[PDB]
């Protein structure tokens, strides 16, 4: 602390000098600026009787009333520059304090434009004039005549930090160049190195690497003129090596760059407890993600394992690992008010600059995190980060950053398919843009000096706004306008790059123009190209849209691996374009009753391009399209691809959660990391990374359980397709995979999925009818339709392939025909004579029907119409009522759109135990946890005295409480809450301490227990959540599902019983009472799935409130 000292001593000079003389007023102004410096970060008013702004305003008036001696001009320049600088700092601190007070009053997004937006034109001019004065001081050959050039250097550092916060990197570059000049003239070799490194860092973040390399060696040269033992030398050398690693990552020298990065990481210096190193760790953690975004072809395998060994599995983790360190540094420096609305600054020179630097780095890291997370498919997390950034920017009242964090939110809202909120956000931005300078920033000259056009950040904001506006145009159905907006984006990006290049040359004064153009706007161009190609797909008539595909392909391939996921999207578009009978049928062994060769190779290339960090939708479309083009040509490959196309965002979230688990430093954890890692495999051709990695995973199924996948094969990215893929994976069982096209039948795969939505809307409409006659008519007219639908799935979609779902007969009885019906079927016309399709069906041979046999024969046997059926029919007839089936639990896996259809009541899967897991790696991680003494429910059983209930959290449902009061209270050894909303501690305890959680209320209790609290605990209790849509993964657009179930399963929940659609009171109460008495009265060792299959017949409408409960997980039972 230096407060009282400087306070008293500055007062001494305040009273020690007169004012009438020209020197006196000057001295008083300097004394007033030093007084403002103290009053700006210390509370002494009561003892000073002056405010920071009043003091600095008086100092400015006095300073503008001074005439120099023609030899002290420089000192007046410096004093005026510092006075303006501290006016800006004190005004900004007043803004921050009143913003904190505003959040104190209110404890939004309408104040985004409420910013006075009238001071931003004077406050910026303060800093502009300060820079002008300091430049005029420090752009001349003669040595500056200022008394103290150290203070000038420090003030230039603070100017650079503030200019970085306000999103003006261009002027921060000039400030840092003047800092380098001051450093060289003052003969301090540490500050020159520090300055040179920031000049490189800023230059590479913009995207010009040549000048970045020039400055890195300029820094390397300065690194020699200083002692080789101090902390300064270690930190500067480590920073120089890290920048070299990043440069090699940019200059296609990854092989040596990774070695430099390994040296950087392994050096114990980046562990010592210091704020300078705490900042250095952020840069290395960002660089680890630049490497982790690389494909598996631009490196060796040993370097990849070396990089992953220390940590940082998927790129997303590294960036969250950074934003945490940045927030921790903020808490260390500026207290905690600026981050949450729930410490003294301690200014000693370094702290002042570090404060603004850490704020700027927080904002930049949040920007990168939002972009990357939204790209993968985690839109919710991106929105969370965006809202945090918007709050921080609103507190500081910086319009440009609010604009970037507003266009990001608009893009995410478009991703979630919410047009109104997206339009509002895009309109909030046109206000900010208008203040900064129908869209009016368009029609500008390619070259101009507009604030929205001379600043790269504002140009990027405008381009992203136009891109999202084009997207919202296309989504609303109003095309043409959206396509033109996308053309504007595609045209504008290169010219913006050209202007940034010219600006960089103007600032840095290098002779030769940049060898490499900036790559900051390349992502915008790639996304625009993707949108144009996708639009061209649905309009094949146009040829300009067709040629766009090639243009985007050259654009993405010309910069490898800078834009890999866009290359994968364009490759999938290219393959689906070359697609349009289907060539797929010649790749499986059945049909309903070359170009492909190159297509499969291109899909293989795209798979490699994104396998390590795949976007969800893109991967799912690719994997299943590759399965279509492959079929039974390589059954293992087809099974791998099909099972690699379901629940990908689930796997991203599980890897991130696992990293958090390990951070809060075990063997099961490590093996689970290896299982979920997108790169844990040996290198090689296609099989080694694909078919092999697959087989390595496929040799892991628990013996006695069938794992089927029902993936709806698409036809065009975005819409529901009319092809369905089925893969029966089992131990010692070669993959049996086929197609079930329903686009040639009467009940197409979209008819069922639209009738489901029609029934849902009818239910929502009838929910508010008073007349008993009208209400009951509607319920009884919807139950019949749902009953019709559940049988459509068995009658039309699965067709002659329900045996592949029913437990296959592992008895030695199929063998008699598994080769008998090949020696004639292949002769009659079979193209690919598979051998497993004749053993997966023999179980329940009596249940096999002659019309089933007809399709099974025609598809297996084309050409000659007589033998084709006759042989298969007589053979199957001879094998009728052969044997009885065993017990084999089933874990059906369904895609994002096939999860909502009731697949459990299908009149073939009624008796058998059927559940539903997100994916296959989940099924095997269940065995890992089940072997390392974890998940005690699957080890011992569900203790009937370890159940917790939450009934009627809000006093709304009197019928429920009336029914389940004594029954839920008299139960031996149970505890719960009725009437009152349970406190958070209590509910977390239930899922963690007990074994069963019966919820009777609205929804899933996302009001008293959100998925966030559930992920932050381990689930030891089976979830029986009986409320509307309690297990429904809402498909809010093209995005995958979302709900509480996908976060109970990540906590280790054995089973999860929740309703799929909305339910009323009495029927679901009947279901709950039936299931509970059935399961808790059966006795020890009683499967839950069996009694659910029984309780389905309790509701009055046995198809609209009886077929709703589904199960997620592995079989549970009593002890």
């Amino acid at each position: 602390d230096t407060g009282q000292e400087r306070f008293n001593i500055i007062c001494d000079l305040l009273e020690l000098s007169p004012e009438e003389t020209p020197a006196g007023a000057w001295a008083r102004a300097t004394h007033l600026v030093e007084l403002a410096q103290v009053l700006c970060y210390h509370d002494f008013t009561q003892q000073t009787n002056c405010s920071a702004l009043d003091a600095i305003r008086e100092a400015l008036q006095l300073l503008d009333s001074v005439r120099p001696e023609a030899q002290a001009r420089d000192q007046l320049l410096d004093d005026k520059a510092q006075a303006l600088l501290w006016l800006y700092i004190c005004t900004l601190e007043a803004k921050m304090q009143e913003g904190i007070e505003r959040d104190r009053r209110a404890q939004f997004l309408y104040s985004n434009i409420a910013f006075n937006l009238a001071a931003d034109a004077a406050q910026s001019k303060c800093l502009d004039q300060a820079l002008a004065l300091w430049k005029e001081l420090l752009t001349k050959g003669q040595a500056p005549a200022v008394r103290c050039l150290q203070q000038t250097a420090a003030s230039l550092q603070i100017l650079a930090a503030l200019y970085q916060l306000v999103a003006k990197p261009m002027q921060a570059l000039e400030v840092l160049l003047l800092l380098r000049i001051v450093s060289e003239r003052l003969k301090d070799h540490s500050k020159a190195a520090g300055s040179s490194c920031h000049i490189t860092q800023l230059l590479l973040t913009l995207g010009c690497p040549s000048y970045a390399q020039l400055h890195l060696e300029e820094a390397a040269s300065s690194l020699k003129h200083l002692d080789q033992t101090t902390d300064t030398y270690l930190l500067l050398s480590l920073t120089c090596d890290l920048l070299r690693s990043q440069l090699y990552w940019t200059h296609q020298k990854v092989t040596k760059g990774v070695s430099l990065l390994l040296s950087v990481l392994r050096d114990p210096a980046l562990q010592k407890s210091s704020k300078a190193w705490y900042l250095l760790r952020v840069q290395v953690l960002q660089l680890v993600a630049a490497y982790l975004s690389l494909p598996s072809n631009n490196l060796s395998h040993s370097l990849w394992e070396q990089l992953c060994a220390q940590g940082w599995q998927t790129p997303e983790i590294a960036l969250i690992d950074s934003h945490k360190l940045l927030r921790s540094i903020i808490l260390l420096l500026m207290g905690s008010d600026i981050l949450s609305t729930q410490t003294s600054f301690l200014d000693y020179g370094e702290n002042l600059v570090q404060k603004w630097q850490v704020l700027s780095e927080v904002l930049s890291c949040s920007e990168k995190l939002v972009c990357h997370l939204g790209r993968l498919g985690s839109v919710s997390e991106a929105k969370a980060f965006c809202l945090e950034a918007l709050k921080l920017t609103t507190k500081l009242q910086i319009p440009r950053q609010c604009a970037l964090f507003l266009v990001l939110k608009g893009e995410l809202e478009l991703a979630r398919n919410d047009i109104d909120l997206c339009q509002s956000d895009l309109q909030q931005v046109l206000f900010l843009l208008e203040s900064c300078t129908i869209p009016n920033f368009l029609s500008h000259s390619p070259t101009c000096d507009c604030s929205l056009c001379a600043s790269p950040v504002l140009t990027a904001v405008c381009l992203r706004w136009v891109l999202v506006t084009a997207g919202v145009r296309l989504a609303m159905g109003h095309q043409a306008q959206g396509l033109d907006l996308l053309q504007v984006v595609l045209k504008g990006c290169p010219e913006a790059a050209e202007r940034l290049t010219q600006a960089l040359q103007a600032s840095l004064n290098h002779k030769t123009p940049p060898s490499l153009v900036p790559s900051l706007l390349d992502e915008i161009l790639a996304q625009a190209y993707t949108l144009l190609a996708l639009e061209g797909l649905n309009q094949p008539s146009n040829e300009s849209l067709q040629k766009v595909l090639q243009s985007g392909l050259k654009f993405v391939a010309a910069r490898i691996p800078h834009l890999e996921p866009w290359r994968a999207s364009l490759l999938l578009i290219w393959a689906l374009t070359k697609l349009g009978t289907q060539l797929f049928a010649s790749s499986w062994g059945w049909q309903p009753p070359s170009t492909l060769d190159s297509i499969c190779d291109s899909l293989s290339v795209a798979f490699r391009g994104i396998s390590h960090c795949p976007p969800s939708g893109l991967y799912a479309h690719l994997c299943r399209f590759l399965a279509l083009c492959l079929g039974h040509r390589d059954p293992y490959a087809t099974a791998f691809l099909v099972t690699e196309s379901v629940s990908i965002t689930c796997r991203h979230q599980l890897l991130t959660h696992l990293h958090r688990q390990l951070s809060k430093q075990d063997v099961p954890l490590a093996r689970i990391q290896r299982l979920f890692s997108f790169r844990a495999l040996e290198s090689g051709h296609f099989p080694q990374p694909e078919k092999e990695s697959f087989q390595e995973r496929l040799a892991l199924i628990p013996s006695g359980v069938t794992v089927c996948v029902l993936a709806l094969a698409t036809l065009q990215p975005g819409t529901v397709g009319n092809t369905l893929l089925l893969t029966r994976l089992e131990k010692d069982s070669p993959p049996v995979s086929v197609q079930i096209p329903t686009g040639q039948n009467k009940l197409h795969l979209r008819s069922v999925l639209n009738e489901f939505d029609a029934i849902q809307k009818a239910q929502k409409e009838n929910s508010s009818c008073t007349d008993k006659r009208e209400w009951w008519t509607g319920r009884l007219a919807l139950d019949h339709r749902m009953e019709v639908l559940i049988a459509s799935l068995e009658k039309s979609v699965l067709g002659c392939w329900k045996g592949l779902l029913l437990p296959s007969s592992e008895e030695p009885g199929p063998a008699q025909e598994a080769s008998r019906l090949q020696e004639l079927l292949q002769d009659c016309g079979w193209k690919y004579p598979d051998r497993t399709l004749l053993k997966i069906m023999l179980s329940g041979a009596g249940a096999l029907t002659p019309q089933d046999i007809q399709a099974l024969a025609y598809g297996l046997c084309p050409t000659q119409p007589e033998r084709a059926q006759e042989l298969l029919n007589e053979a199957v007839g001879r094998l009728q009522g052969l044997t009885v089936p065993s017990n084999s639990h089933l874990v059906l896996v369904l895609d994002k759109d096939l999860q909502k259809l009731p697949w459990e009541s299908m009149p073939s899967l009624q008796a058998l135990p059927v559940t539903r897991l997100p994916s296959f790696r989940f099924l095997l991680s269940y065995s890992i946890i089940k072997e390392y003494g974890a998940s005690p429910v699957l080890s011992q059983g569900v203790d009937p005295r370890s159940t917790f209930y939450v009934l009627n959290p809000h006093n709304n449902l009197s019928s429920t409480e009336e029914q389940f009061r004594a029954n839920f209270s008299s139960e031996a050894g149970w505890r719960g809450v009725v009437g009152e909303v349970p406190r958070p501690e209590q509910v977390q305890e239930a899922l963690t301490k007990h074994d069963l959680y019966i919820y009777a209320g609205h929804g899933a209790g996302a009001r008293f227990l959100d998925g966030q609290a559930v992920l932050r605990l381990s689930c030891r209790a089976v979830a029986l959540l009986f409320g509307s849509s309690s297990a429904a993964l809402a498909v809010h657009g093209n995005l995958e599902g979302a709900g509480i179930v996908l976060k109970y399963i990540m906590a280790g929940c054995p089973l999860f019983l929740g309703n799929l659609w909305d339910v009323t009171d009495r029927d679901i109460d009947r279901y709950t009472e039936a299931l509970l008495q059935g399961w808790l009265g059966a006795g020890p060792g009683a499967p839950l799935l069996y009694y659910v299959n029984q309780a389905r017949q309790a509701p009055r409408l046995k198809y609209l409130i009886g077929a709703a409960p589904i199960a997620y997980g592995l079989p549970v039972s009593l002890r």
Binding site: K275, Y278, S328, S959, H1002, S1028, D1062, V1063
Partner: peptide
């Protein structure tokens, strides 16, 4: 039709729908 029979049916029900990391402390330099 069935209007007189629907009189004996019970009154309509009600739906079961509402229809409505901490930054760490780094060691000081």
């Amino acid at each position: 039709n069935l209007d007189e029979f629907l009189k004996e049916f019970e009154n309509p029900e009600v739906p079961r729908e509402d229809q409505q990391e901490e930054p760490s402390r780094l060691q000081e330099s």
